[PDB]
Amino acid sequence: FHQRCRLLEGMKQALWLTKTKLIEGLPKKVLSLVDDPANHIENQEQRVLDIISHARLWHSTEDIPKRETYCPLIVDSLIQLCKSQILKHPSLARRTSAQNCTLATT
Amino acid sequence: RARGNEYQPSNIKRKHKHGWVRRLSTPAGVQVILRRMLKGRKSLSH
Amino acid sequence: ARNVLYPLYQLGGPQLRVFRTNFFIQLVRPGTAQPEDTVQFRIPMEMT
Amino acid sequence: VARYPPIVASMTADSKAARQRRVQRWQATVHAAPSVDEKIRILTKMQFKKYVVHPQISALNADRWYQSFTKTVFVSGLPPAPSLDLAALRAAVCDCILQEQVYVRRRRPRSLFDRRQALASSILDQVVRTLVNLLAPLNPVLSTAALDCKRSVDFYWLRGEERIPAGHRKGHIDALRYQINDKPHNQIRISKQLPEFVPLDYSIPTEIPVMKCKPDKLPLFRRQYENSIFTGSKTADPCCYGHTQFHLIPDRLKRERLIRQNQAEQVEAVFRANAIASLFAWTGAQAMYQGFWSEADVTRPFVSQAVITDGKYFSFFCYQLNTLALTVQADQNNPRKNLCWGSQSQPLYETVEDNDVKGFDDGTLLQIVHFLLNKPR
RNA sequence: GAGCUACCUAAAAACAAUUUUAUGAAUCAACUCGUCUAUGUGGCAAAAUAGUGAGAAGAUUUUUAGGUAGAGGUGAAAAGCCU
RNA sequence: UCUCCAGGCAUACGCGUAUAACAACUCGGAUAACCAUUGUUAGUUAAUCAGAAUAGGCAAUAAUCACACUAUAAAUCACCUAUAACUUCUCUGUUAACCCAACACCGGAAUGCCUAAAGGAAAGAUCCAAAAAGAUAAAAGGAACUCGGCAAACAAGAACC
Ligand SMILES: [Mg+2]
Ligand SMILES: [Mg+2]
Ligand SMILES: [Mg+2]
Ligand SMILES: [Mg+2]
Ligand SMILES: [Mg+2]
Ligand SMILES: [Mg+2]
Ligand SMILES: [Mg+2]
Ligand SMILES: [Mg+2]
Ligand SMILES: [Mg+2]
Ligand SMILES: [Mg+2]
Ligand SMILES: [Mg+2]
Ligand SMILES: [Mg+2]
Ligand SMILES: [Mg+2]
Ligand SMILES: [Mg+2]
Ligand SMILES: [Mg+2]
Ligand SMILES: [Mg+2]
Ligand SMILES: [Mg+2]
Ligand SMILES: [Mg+2]
Ligand SMILES: [Mg+2]
Ligand SMILES: [Mg+2]
Ligand SMILES: [Mg+2]
Ligand SMILES: [Mg+2]
Ligand SMILES: [Mg+2]
Ligand SMILES: [Mg+2]
């Protein structure tokens, strides 16, 4: 199974292959983390709108940027915004990222 | 309208139609070359 | 060298040495204005 | 009380004075233009054949030529003149370098020539991201900043005039158009303007090199495409000023290749040419966003920084955009010249073996940290 | 001999503003065409010029390369076109 | 410097030195000045502009700001599985007022951007004749002109076969 592979049955086939049971909705532990206003970022709503506007219009000289340049930008921008919480939580300094990694199993 | 400008030069069109490789493709074209060599022509084709 | 055969090169071939060279070149006065370092030459058309 | 008509040239006459008055009429529309975007549109709506300046260029002595195109004086050294977690920053920088070469897999490249360049690009990209985050607690400005990778910075300006040498327009006056279209590897854009490195109008003994010949002698050709003044983001972007630029020298221009080509002196000239070209384009574009253009000289100098590397070595340059009035009409009696300060290249790390980076020099890391920590007043 | 022209294949490009609506509909440029009058008539022109007119999101126009050849080709048939 | 006109700069196809300076004043420009002409000398500088490894496996889901919205004419190598090779800058295009029309032809010529910041000059000097061509103005009348309201009009509205 590789990137381009498309399962005809969608989720159901994936469940059978990996022997997993599906629960709808994120874990309550994850959801409750952002319900606390202490985790809320300053000007969160405004900054997100700028990122969306930057992602789709302002980043390229052209008029209508193509999806080959604003789906990576939107995700990269948000991660570089969520990663601004190092000020509140110094523990976030213990992580780093990579690009186009290779994962395989048998 | 106004005639006289039928010739619309294109080097790709010219060489394909009356070129060396085009002439040699058929024996009827090779006999065009053979006669031209007999006469003494400066240019045997395009 | 010009008007001579260059041996065909395939993987692992020796280096090509031309002991006596047919390329003869001449230095000309620039037609336009050129930087002090720049120098103009007229060379055989087969020279790289 | 005789209301004489003004002693000015006719608008519609076919004369040099009449032509000049018509030019002033066009400039008037720019002056009265309501918004910056309309100002830029009026300036660049017409496209003429323009030299294409390349910040990363192999031409000999491109640095000196680029100064004349920009009127930038290169002064060697740094501009005239807290607690840091060096263990964390030093360890983090090593992690990015080591993680990439020793660890991580990806799919081994196909072309056998860009592998080292591809490896060099990723270490630079990752190191910048980590430092921005790791330096964020020390400087909160980076949190408000925007980090862009491989975005486009453009600037189109007029400097000098020439008489058309041949054709039907022989002898017609033609301005010399230059443009810079650049894609800096990494850049930081901040809303607030950075502090000045020197008071505006500061005079220095050094003078711009004057080139006898035309710009075509060093390989530099002309094309007619869209003129664009772009700061890496559109005018609507709240973040319009600049903080620092990261540039990667291409493989062809690396130290070893130049030595074999016998152009040893160009080892550092390559760095100077890119720094002058890119920073002027970035700072120059910023001024247009604030509304300043050639006739209306910038009241407040614009300052930006850049760091240029070949993968291993690093050199840092500082720039100040004293003037945009780089035209024959607007440069008649202009005593202000742009100032650029540069430092020699330093090797960040000698080489990597096993899981340790050999020959790591803290001085290079300290200088990078100082640039990132510079903040608006 | 299909670089003109009739037709076709493939790869492409152009179409503002306005009103309808959701279109081989409307007003009208670019653009395509060529109803009428006038001038010209060895003419600017071996078919043009000045006005006036028709279409202008479509059976649309245009570009590039290729194919069909005379006992033939092509033809929304004028015995029309094929330098 | 003044007066006035309003398709201009690039690209492609094409053309092939018509480019530029000097010198000539035979020829060419339908006349002169000047050269587009003659002779000699020069010229257009690119890793970015432009042009020129193998064997398998397998793709239901247009475009139009693609979200909503529907429709019908049903609509552009990649990614994997293995083998092979492990560090490069050569070559060619680049000039001009240019091409198809025997012509320095009121004709034909595709795309990009812009509409004067770019590009240009209708009159060699004279003169005010007839005829001819074009533009504008008209007392009274208003198609009485004519094959016909052709052309023109301060009109450009209505109905019919
Ligand atoms: Mg003929
Ligand atoms: Mg044709
Ligand atoms: Mg002019
Ligand atoms: Mg054809
Ligand atoms: Mg037909
Ligand atoms: Mg339309
Ligand atoms: Mg017709
Ligand atoms: Mg109509
Ligand atoms: Mg109609
Ligand atoms: Mg219609
Ligand atoms: Mg019939
Ligand atoms: Mg015939
Ligand atoms: Mg000449
Ligand atoms: Mg002369
Ligand atoms: Mg003539
Ligand atoms: Mg000559
Ligand atoms: Mg290229
Ligand atoms: Mg050219
Ligand atoms: Mg005249
Ligand atoms: Mg007269
Ligand atoms: Mg009248
Ligand atoms: Mg009358
Ligand atoms: Mg009657
Ligand atoms: Mg009538």
* Distance (Å, whole) CA D57 – CA D52: 11
Which residues 133-192 of chain D have a CB under 7 Å from nucleic chain F?
165-170, 172-173
H or E element at residue D274: helix D266-290
Question: Which residues from D are below 8 Å from C34, CB to CB?
Answer: 213, 217
H or E element at residue D21: helix D16-31
The alpha carbon of D279 and the centre of ligand 20 are apart by a number of angstroms equal to 63
Nucleotide minimizing C1' to CA distance for residue C29: F42
The CA distance from D42 to D25, in Å, is 12
Sort strands D302-309 and D241-248 into parallel, antiparallel or unpaired. parallel
**Spatial CB neighbours of D202, under 8 Å, sequence gap ≥ 6:** D339
Q: What CA–CA distance (Å, rounded) separates A41 from A84?
A: 9
**Chain B partners (3+ C-beta pairs within 8 A):** none
- CB contacts < 8 A, A to D, total 60
| Integer angstrom CA distances of residue D301 from D202, D210, D255, D279, D337 | 11, 24, 34, 13, 11
Q: Report residues 5-44 of C contacting strand F, contact meaning Cβ closer than 7 Å.
A: 28, 30-32, 34, 38, 40
* Residue D251 beta carbon within 7 A of nucleic strand F: yes
Is the Cβ–Cβ distance between C33 and D213 less than 8 Å? Answer: yes
Q: Is the CB of residue D9 less than 8 Å from the CB of residue D15?
A: yes
Asked whether residue D60, judged by its CB, lies under 7 Å from any atom of the DNA or RNA strand F, the reply is: no
Q: Which chains have at least 3 CB atom pairs separated by less than 8 Å from chain A?
A: D
Q: Do A101 and D126 touch (CB under 8 A)?
A: no
**Closest to D274 (Cα-Cα) out of D252, D251, D248:** D248
Q: Taking CA atoms, what residue in D is nearest to A55?
A: D233
> What's the Cα-to-Cα distance from D173 to each of D20, D168, D355, rounded to whole Å?
12, 13, 64
Residues in D touching C35 (Cβ below 8 Å): 211-213, 217-218
In a mutational test of the D interface, the residue from A46, A51, A80, A89 whose CB has the highest number of chain D CBs within 10 Å is A80
Distance from CA of C3 to the nearest CA of D (A): 29
Q: Which of D211, D214, D217 sits opposite C38 (nearest CB)?
A: D217
How far apart are the CA of D191 and the centre of ligand 6, in A?
A: 42
Query: Can you tell me the distance from the alpha carbon of A73 to that of A57, in angstroms, rounded to the nearest whole number?
Result: 11
Please tell me if residue C13 touches chain D, with a CB cutoff of 8 Å.
no
Ligand 10 centroid from CA D356, angstroms: 74
Q: Do D137 and A87 touch (CB under 8 A)?
A: yes
Q: How many CA atoms lie within 13 A of D203 on its CB side?
A: 3
CA atoms within 13 A on the CB side of B6: 2
C40 close to D (CB below 8 A): no
Q: Which of D213, D252, D221, D263 is nearest to D65 (CA)?
A: D213
Torsion, CA C38, CA D51, CA D330, CA D212, rounded to 10 = 10
In this complex, which residue's CA is closest to the C1' atom of nucleotide F15? Answer: B9
CB-neighbour burial class of residue B29 (10 A; exposed 0-12, middle 13-18, buried 19+): middle
Q: Nearest C-alpha of chain C: how many angstroms from D55?
A: 21
Euclidean distance between CA atoms C44 and C41, whole angstroms: 10
Locate D92 and state its tokens. 């983090």
The region that residue D232 occupies, defined by phi over 0 for left and psi between -120 and 50 for alpha, beta otherwise, is left
Whether D213 and C37 lie within 8 Å, measured CB to CB: no
CA-CA-CA-CA torsion sign (D25, D28, D30, D35)? negative
CA of B6 to the centre of ligand 4 (A): 12
Closest to D347 measured CA to CA, from D297, D301, D311:
D311
Q: Which of D365, D99, D146 lies closest to A95 in space, CA to CA?
A: D99
Element holding D132 (H helix, E strand): helix D115-135
Chain D residues in contact with chain A using a Cβ-Cβ cutoff of 8 Å: 88, 92, 95-96, 99, 104-107, 122, 126, 129-130, 133-134, 136-137, 140, 143, 146-149, 151-152, 154, 228, 230, 233-234, 236-238
DSSP string, C1-30: --SSPPPP--TTPPPP--SS-----EE---
3-state secondary structure chain B: CCCCCCCCCCHHHHHHHHCHHHHHHCHHHHHHHHHHHHHCCCCCCC
Q: Which residue has the least CA–C1' distance to nucleotide E66?
A: B13
Residues of C in contact with D217 (CB under 8 A): 33-35, 38
- From first CA to last CA, the distance across chain B in angstroms is 31
* CB D247, CB D184: distance < 8 Å: yes
For D82, the 3-state DSSP assignment is: coil
